[PDB]
Amino acid sequence: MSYNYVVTAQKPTAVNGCVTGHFTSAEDLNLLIAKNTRLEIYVVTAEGLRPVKEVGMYGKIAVMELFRPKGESKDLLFILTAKYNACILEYKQSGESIDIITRAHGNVQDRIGRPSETGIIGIIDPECRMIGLRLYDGLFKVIPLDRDNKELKAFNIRLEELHVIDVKFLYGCQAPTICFVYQDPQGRHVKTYEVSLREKEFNKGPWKQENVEAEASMVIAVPEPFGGAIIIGQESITYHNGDKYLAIAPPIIKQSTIVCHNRVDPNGSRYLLGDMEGRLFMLLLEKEEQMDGTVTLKDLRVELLGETSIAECLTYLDNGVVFVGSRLGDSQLVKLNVDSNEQGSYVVAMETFTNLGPIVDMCVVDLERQGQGQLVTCSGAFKEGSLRIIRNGIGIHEHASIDLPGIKGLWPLRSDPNRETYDTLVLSFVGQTRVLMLNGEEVEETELMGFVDDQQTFFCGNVAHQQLIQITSASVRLVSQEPKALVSEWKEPQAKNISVASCNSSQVVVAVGRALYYLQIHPQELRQISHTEMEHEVACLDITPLGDSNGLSPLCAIGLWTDISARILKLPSFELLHKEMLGGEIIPRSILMTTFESSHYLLCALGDGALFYFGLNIETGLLSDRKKVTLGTQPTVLRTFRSLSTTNVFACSDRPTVIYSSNHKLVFSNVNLKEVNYMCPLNSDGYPDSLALANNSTLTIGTIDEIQKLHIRTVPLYESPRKICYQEVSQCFGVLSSRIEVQDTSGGTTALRPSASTQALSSSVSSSKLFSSGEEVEVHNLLIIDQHTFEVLHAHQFLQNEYALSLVSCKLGKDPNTYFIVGTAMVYPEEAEPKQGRIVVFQYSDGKLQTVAEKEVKGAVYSMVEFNGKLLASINSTVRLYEWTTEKDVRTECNHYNNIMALYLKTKGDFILVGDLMRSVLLLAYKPMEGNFEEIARDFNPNWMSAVEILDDDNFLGAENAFNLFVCQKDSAATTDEERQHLQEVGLFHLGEFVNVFCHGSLVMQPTQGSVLFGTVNGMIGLVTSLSESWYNLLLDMQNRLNKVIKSVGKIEHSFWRSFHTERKTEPATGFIDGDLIESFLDISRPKMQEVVANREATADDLIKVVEELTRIH
């Protein structure tokens, strides 16, 4: 009975896989990108990448190939998951609906098999006779491809070689033929076999096993024309075919290891090569022809091309474009050119996609001091290293502040016919109209001719032919640019008000009720035209010249009262087309027609906060689809702002909201503001690219950040960050950081690039003398980072071969000072494990960093928390609890010894602790007795931890080794001396990410309990929350129901995916919930949604609003 809820706050950003080919159309170039459990499909174009389809999977993509057997229209996609979920996909567009369909699928694991060296490797023969797999040492699986085999049945074949490094099939081969470097004692070797599937056995390969080098690791299979195999090692590259043997040792590649490659030219003249260094190489094969004879090979060379991010994944695209998949850093779009610009680099970045990459540590801070957390993560490794500042919502910058308890509208207003700048904002008000002349950036309310001051304005548009409009309760009024006074005036033939006001800059359409007139602002006068009456009271109206119409506007829509409805109708005719018949007793406050790309838009706000959304037709006039959100309870006023090239839709609720554009879809991110009433684009000389926003009382004006549910602000560190503390009083951050250096010729160490520790503003080295006794080394720092500017204020450099592994920022003991404590460790490649390090206590001043105190220790200080004015601190195996002398020194009080190696600790307010490397977690107390440690309980499972957290006094989150999460609580039981020294694993769940850090924090606000965020190797930011047993239950059912309804991709079983799994063990998930899956609900059609019910009560659209009320947990 443990009840947690896990949700993705940020999908994985790292790139594990990318492949290219014609998946979409036989004529289309696709980039397939594998995230972890996300598959992105793109079309390659002139601009770069056209986003097409982003499907998710219930597994980690471990193999991703496109391939094409005979008589197949276009390419098919083969996907192997890491729980050995194999499956085949086809791209399938039903005209406008897109589907990725599973042509085949089966689970390919074997109970026998210890998974191997180089992990899963799945390859596919040129002729498409089959797929070959190396899941286990000794065996080699083969899934024969056929019309059938729809359940991917496969045999194994025993493999003499117990240690394969890499395999592929060879081109130009009568039989299927594999080629593989492999390691046994005397070095590595390259062997071959045919594959006769007729007989489920291997056949002497076309050519003798030879040798390849000690560090040989890639195998490339040069395409038909040349045929053969390329082998890459350190400093060396070699080529094999029968009795052919070319080979080079280009000093240039020795510098670092090649790591990923890509075939540039279909024929195989060229290949890209990735370095651990971020370096890009061209491998070129020099072809050779004889008259009537197939092409031989003369030579192979390596041309250094430049620098990319540390690449996992390379894919050559169109013309000099290269996609560059990175996990240690940002993935990027890259251009090769024939020439080398400044520096001599033939590489040029075109685009950069943000990868939170390895999130390694992180913390939560409301930097501006609001009540929303921003989140600050140490990311990347080596040069890609960085801080990333992550902020929910779209905020805006507040220029003036004029408290006006009323404002019931506002529109812009250039008082000069030329400039884009408006110096007025005539604001509808609580039954009046004040004008707002501006001295520039200065506020002033004066008169204006032919514009009322005692009569409430409903509009001010920007009507052409040198004039200014004012639709009032009463009459649509008129003022000129030349005349500027009385020009004309419309008035209803009865002495009767205008109810609903409209206008673009050419059209005028009003409404007396059902009455729908129509008038025009013709050169100096308002001439009348049409008239109609509708079933019911006109609630609201939208008109704007959209695409193929300057000024004068085509078709339309409207919402009336009693039927609660919105319907499609024309202009001078007013002819009714299709309609919707929305429900409830509350009317549509706002209707709007817009455009962005290739689709015209209709949206309709009701007074219950909620919105119904649809897509119209400049031509026809029909009915799109149907959904129902729930922005701010209060009615929503839809409008359009000036932003970039896809100028967007701002929605004014109690919960202000932007509506942007997704694929070509439309974003729904929060706007970071109190409450917005009405809003309009503006631009004076004194407030340009402004947006103007009235609230319960206040005019405001400002620009607008990105878009995304999340804004991410990065800080390039150029070395690899490791830990992160926010010491508030000093308005800065502490950041442990690590930079690499190479051995000199004076033997010492230099550096490979300026880092953030070398470009520090001030700086320090460790002077301390506590110890005595090409090539790479690591040099560690504490960085001091300004929270506002993100500048390395100060840098402290540690000893020689000292690694700083923990950072706290705390006051200690009586001491009113706020320290930065850093635990450290001396480390030598020889030694299995350091036997010495030191805790160091520092303070940062007006601008100074002083070594306030040190303290030797006989291990690695893996972690430390601030206990209670005491400093609790894992050392190597021991868990020690320090005290600050008033003399200001750290002195031992007690220690716990029973840990294989304490990697982690956390502290529940009271006197309670937790953590361990391999098995698993211990829970502890401090006893203000003899100030001892009593070891309360432990979990007795073999979990190699990576991250640990305390949810509450009893519940303990824990993440491990194998992408599982688990929760523990103490066994409330009789016989309290065994069943108490043991705490049971009550929540089990396969996340499918590797978790580095948990922390308490939340990214939202000014049903669930708490909020713990975690950050993963892949750039995923998730969140874990607690639940009520009842809420657990509803949701657990809702999950099971939700599955039957949902077709997974690859026909993977949701629960197979979510199941706890360490090689040696597989239970299903208990006590956990993916809201990720719950949230799936919303993306289900109302029928498939109904289904989900059949059954204190049971509804149909309650739940579709129970789900909403969760999405806003982040």
Binding site: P358, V360, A381, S720, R722, P829, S946, F994, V1017
Partner: peptide, 13 residues
């Protein structure tokens, strides 16, 4: 050490 190793598993593979 296991430090080169924690730090390693740190970034990933």
């Amino acid at each position: 050490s296991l430090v080169y190793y924690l730090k390693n598993r740190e970034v990933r593979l």
